[PDB]
């Protein structure tokens, strides 16, 4: 059992922090130099662990006033081992990140501390960077707004604080550079992932995708948007509430074919019109305004589903963003084109060491074992949870639930206890803010749109008589501190208003209330026309909401609706489980291909002579060109060798240098050797006249341009294959094996095209 | 908008009739034009017989709206202001050491398709020079068309010189003075000096019988 090992190491650190206490600064900052030279002579980080942890304990008490508890040392040892430290919400996970981050930044290779958003990254960077810069290391903070030089300074520091999006995008942009000295990241060495279950379980359902702008079309967006704006929500389309899929009906298809003058919408010449009609339908019906996006400064800005904040650079793929901009009446932008793609599983499994800490890991433990080979370690609390988690108050309608929520917030405001109401969308947050505006209750709102005042709102949210309505922004890592007298009122009642997509997320909201042994109440007010119940509730229990009556002043005191609420949430969790499993194995196929391509593109970049690489490319292209003619079947002179001579003179050997007589009646390998040594002397004349390093610049540009263009086309073709592959499961094959085999064939044809393009552009230039 | 509507591929009809020294010629052809990449892939066929003046002396007479524009020169085009309304261009083409072309063309979207209706009249010619002696190599060079605007006529005056590879080993430097006129009178856009960096390619079809010119051509602009 490892937990007794963690307790033993924590007691070791306790004895020697007795030893480390009476040391001045410049004698405690000297311990970093001492550990660095001991780590360069012969020691490992595992031998230095107790002395480094005692130095961080003393330095933290000297800087921040906090002296880490022994459960924080247990979580630090569990993070140094590469495990997942599941300390509860409020327990002190930021100091327990600073223990193994200091221990593993002494070797000089760099530690990445990953968080969920940029508020938490900047907050932790400020406080724990005060600790680390006392000790003598360097803390960079990698933000979305920085330039490449500031990012390179942030990654060159000893400890880098960033969010998971910026790390993924920096990796993807480092494999699109032309010079090696444009890469910002160092080799990936250690990642401490704060809120692991958000990053590695929840947000790992999505890939990071870097796009680049393609040509602009606008007329079909306005045409399809003007068509869909007259379309009668039940006769001409069906909106499926379960999976938010909007489809035309046969009346709507008839009206579409009449409005555009076409005869069949489902031809292969009207696939662009059908795509524009479908994306205008999804933009109108399935994408509600203040729920899914916002309109800021004449632009559609996406509100993130997990973090609940605006994603400024990010745009919807496949023409949905342009359909939303046509719907809103804004300027329709250009299309896009996927340049690079990675998932968070495949990104963080490149990291040579991976740790993590969260409050809510234990239910996902086997997933952390199957993918990341990380073991969830549960840490004690050192002070018991006095937080009061009351059961949910289920109502019939949303108007009755919101009247109850406003009445609860009103009667907690009268005593002086601070309230934090937790919604999800921006529009329900504004609805409940106007529900408290009349009733005369002064509040703050923390939406995606109110992100500028966030660090101010959180500093006032725990005062006496402080109502804060907050979306997903608050309920993940936000540390609300209680004001004077608030701990006697049982401070910070969290009033949730909906169930989220897992028990982990609403446990995180309750964790905003708890906060290390302080009192707190967490009441959830659900409803029966909540979006979780409407979308994932089973159709049996969705029939007796007339049986419960139509009053909504008192909650439904049943036990069949509580089973329905829990089963709907378990249905969402199972759907997300299978969706992230599917994305995992199919991006394992693209992960193998991408790792081959990116490793060889990098060693094209830092190779100070490319003659052997380009000559092997020309020889492989030439062997395939020889074997494309000259087949094994028709040996005696049915070999069409003047066509091969024409191909060599059009691709390799400048228009006159080969005749039929040079390769007449030859074996394929001896004509290969004849053409190949003619190619070598032509290359040597090119390298003589062209220059020596100028020739390397020339063919580096050729090779990298070919690799980039064929790899973007391969990402597109691989996406199209993954569209049709379940239809391949209709023929009683395994569709994953069909995906792997067709992806291998597609990849090898892509590499043959890379070699053909490089051979042609080098030899014929 | 207008030609910002025609970002997709465009059908190109070319019709040319003309006279040099009382000798008749009539060449037609069809192909495609693209603006977001800015290229012209055109299959042209001499439908009268033999060429009095050769194909290289024809190619600047053979549809300048199919340029490729990067993001900054989008304001600075004239050739997306008179379209789809229509376009008219006439040129004075002075051959040094020979006579003069006066070419007479209207380039407009007839129905949908880009039709270039050209009547060419070549005067001041002596037949024993190089052009009617057919001394041209089957090629066309790369050039820079200089574009400026005039506001008394509110149109475009274009100046350029072109260079024909003569088969004796010389070049015919010939200068084009070009006048460019709208047909409709909507939003005209008269920018400053800029230049079309253009390049071409002349080739043939191995499975075609008669005397035909295959044209492939790239246009880019720069300057502003």
């Amino acid at each position, epitope marked *: 059992r490892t937990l007794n090992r963690y307790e033993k190491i924590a007691n070791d650190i306790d004895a020697i922090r007795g030893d480390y206490e009476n040391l001045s600064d410049d004698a405690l900052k000297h311990k970093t130099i001492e550990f660095k030279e001991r780590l360069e002579k012969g020691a490992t980080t595992d031998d230095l662990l107790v002395e480094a942890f005692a130095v961080v304990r003393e330095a933290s008490r000297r800087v921040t006033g906090m002296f880490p508890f022994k459960v924080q040392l247990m979580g630090g040892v569990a993070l140094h081992d590469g495990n997942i430290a599941e300390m509860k919400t409020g327990e002190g996970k930021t100091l327990t990140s600073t223990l193994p981050v200091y221990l593993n930044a002494l070797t000089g290779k760099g530690v990445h501390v990953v968080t969920v958003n940029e508020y938490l990254a900047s907050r932790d960077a400020e406080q724990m960077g005060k600790i680390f810069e006392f000790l003598g290391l360097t803390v960079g903070l990698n933000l979305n707004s920085m330039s490449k030089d500031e990012k390179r300074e942030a990654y060159a520091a000893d400890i880098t604080y960033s969010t998971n999006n910026e790390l993924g995008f920096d990796y993807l942009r480092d494999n699109m550079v032309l010079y090696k000295e444009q890469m910002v990241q160092r080799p990936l060495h250690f990642a401490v992932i704060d809120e692991v279950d958000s990053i590695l379980i929840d947000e790992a359902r999505t890939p990071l995708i870097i796009s680049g702008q393609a040509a602009k079309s606008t007329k079909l967006y306005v045409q399809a948007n003007a068509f869909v704006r007259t379309l009668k929500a039940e006769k001409d389309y069906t909106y499926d509430i379960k999976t938010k899929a909007v489809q035309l009906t046969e009346e709507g298809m008839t009206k579409a074919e009449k409005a555009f003058g076409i005869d069949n919408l489902f031809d292969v010449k009207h696939v662009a019109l059908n795509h524009h009609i479908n994306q205008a339908l999804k933009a109108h019906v399935a994408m509600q305004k203040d729920v899914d996006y916002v309109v800021e400064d004449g632009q559609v800005v996406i509100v993130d589903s997990f973090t609940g904040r605006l994603m400024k650079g990010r745009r919807y793929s496949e023409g949905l963003h342009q359909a939303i901009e046509a719907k809103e009446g804004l300027e329709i932008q250009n299309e896009s084109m996927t340049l690079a793609t990675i998932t968070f599983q495949n990104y963080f499994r490149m990291y040579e060491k991976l740790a993590g800490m969260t409050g809510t890991a234990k239910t996902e433990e086997e997933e952390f074992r199957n993918i990341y080979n990380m073991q969830v370690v549960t840490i004690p609390t050192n002070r018991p949870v006095v937080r009061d988690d009351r059961p949910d108050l289920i109502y019939r309608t949303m108007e009755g639930k919101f009247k109850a929520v406003a009445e609860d917030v009103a009667q907690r405001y009268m005593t002086g206890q601070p309230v934090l109401v937790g919604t999800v969308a921006v529009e329900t947050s504004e609805l409940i803010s106007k529900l408290l505006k009349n009733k005369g209750i002064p509040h703050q709102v923390l939406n995606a749109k109110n992100h500028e005042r966030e660090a101010q709102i959180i500093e006032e949210a725990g005062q006496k008589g402080a109502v804060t309505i907050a979306t997903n922004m608050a309920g993940r890592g936000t540390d609300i501190k209680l004001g004077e007298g608030v701990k006697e009122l049982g401070g910070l009642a969290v009033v949730g208003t909906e169930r989220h997509e897992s028990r982990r997320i609403d446990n995180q909201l309750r964790g905003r209330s708890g906060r290390q042994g302080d009192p707190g109440i967490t009441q959830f007010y659900l409803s029966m026309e909540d979006e979780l119940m409407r979308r994932f509730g089973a159709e049996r229990t969705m029939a007796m909401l007339d049986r419960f009556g139509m009053d909504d002043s008192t909650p439904i005191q049943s036990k069949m609706v509580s089973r329905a609420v829990e089963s709907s949430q378990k249905r969402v969790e199972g759907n997300n489980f299978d969706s992230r499993k599917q994305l995992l194995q199919y991006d394992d196929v693209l992960r193998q291909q991408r790792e081959v391509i990116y490793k060889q593109r990098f060693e094209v970049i830092d190779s100070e002579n490319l003659r052997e690489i380009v000559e092997n490319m020309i020889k492989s292209s030439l062997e395939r060109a020889i074997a494309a003619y000259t087949p094994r079947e028709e040996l005696p002179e049915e070999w069409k060798l003047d066509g091969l001579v024409d191909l060599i003179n059009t691709t390799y050997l400048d228009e006159g240098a080969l005749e039929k007589s040079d390769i007449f009646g030859k074996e394929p390998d001896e004509m290969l050797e004849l053409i190949m040594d003619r190619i070598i002397t032509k290359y040597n004349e090119k390298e003589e006249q*062209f220059g020596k390093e100028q020739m390397r610049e020339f063919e580096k540009v050729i090779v990298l341009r070919a690799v980039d263009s064929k790899w973007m086309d391969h990402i597109d073709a691989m996406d199209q294959l993954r569209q049709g592959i379940h239809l391949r499961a209709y023929a009683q094959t395994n569709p994953l094996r069909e995906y792997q085999m067709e992806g291998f064939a597609m990849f090898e044809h892509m590499i043959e095209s890379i070699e053909d393009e490089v051979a042609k552009f080098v030899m*014929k*230039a | 908008k207008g030609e910002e509507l025609f970002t997709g591929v465009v059908p190109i009809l070319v019709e040319l009739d003309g006279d040099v020294n009382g000798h008749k010629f009539s060449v037609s052809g069809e192909g495609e034009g693209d603006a977001t990449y800015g290229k012209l892939t055109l299959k042209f066929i001499c439908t009268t017989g033999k060429l009095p003046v050769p194909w290289p002396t024809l190619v600047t007479t053979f549809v300048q709206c199919f340029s490729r524009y990067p993001d900054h020169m989008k304001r600075h085009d004239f050739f997306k202001s008179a379209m789809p309304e229509g376009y008219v261009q006439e040129r004075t083409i002075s051959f040094k050491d020979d006579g003069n072309y006066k070419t007479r063309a209207e380039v407009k979207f007839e129905g949908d398709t880009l039709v270039n209706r050209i009547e060419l009249k070549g005067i001041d010619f002596k037949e024993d020079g190089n052009i009617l002696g057919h001394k041209l190599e089957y090629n066309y060079n790369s050039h820079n068309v200089y574009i400026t605007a005039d506001k008394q006529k509110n149109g475009i005056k274009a100046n350029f010189k072109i260079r024909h590879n003569i088969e004796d*080993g010389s070049v015919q430097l010939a200068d084009h003075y070009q006048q460019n006129t709208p047909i409709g009178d909507g939003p005209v856009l008269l920018p400053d000096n800029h230049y079309l960096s253009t390049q071409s390619a002349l080739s043939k079809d191995p499975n075609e019988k008669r005397d035909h010119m295959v044209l492939l051509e790239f246009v880019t602009a720069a300057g502003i």
Partner: nanobody, 113 residues
Framework: VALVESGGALVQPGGSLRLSCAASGFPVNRYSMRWYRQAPGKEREWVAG????????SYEDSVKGRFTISRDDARNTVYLQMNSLKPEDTAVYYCNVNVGFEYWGQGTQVTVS
């Protein structure tokens, strides 16, 4: 395809110097190569050049009777000459060929002073 010129030096007006242009990517046996020049401030004019190899070669009348463009296919390069040049013909000389596209040389600076 990438014409590179060399052989350009400061030549006094009584000395004649050949100018070489190495062709890389096409044979000189079947392409007419031309020698242009452009002085600083001047517009780029055509000086000399011959096509379809060796049976005919033309020049401009400022070098007619003086210059001679030659070539060698085994070396696959073309050569000019700067014989009897006057300070009026200070320029950067350019090697020009037309195989499909039009390829220009980088330019060799000769100033006769």
């Amino acid at each position: 395809v990438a014409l590179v010129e060399s052989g350009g030096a400061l030549v006094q007006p009584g000395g004649s110097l050949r100018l070489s242009c190495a062709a890389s990517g096409f044979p000189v046996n079947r392409y007419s190569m031309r020698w242009y020049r452009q002085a600083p401030g001047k517009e780029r004019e055509w000086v000399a050049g011959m096509s379809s190899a060796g049976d005919r070669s033309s020049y401009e009348d400022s070098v007619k009777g003086r210059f001679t463009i030659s070539r060698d296919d085994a070396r696959n390069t073309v050569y000019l000459q700067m014989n009897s040049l006057k300070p009026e013909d200070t320029a950067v000389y350019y090697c020009n060929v037309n195989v499909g596209f039009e390829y220009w040389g980088q330019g060799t600076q000769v100033t006769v002073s």
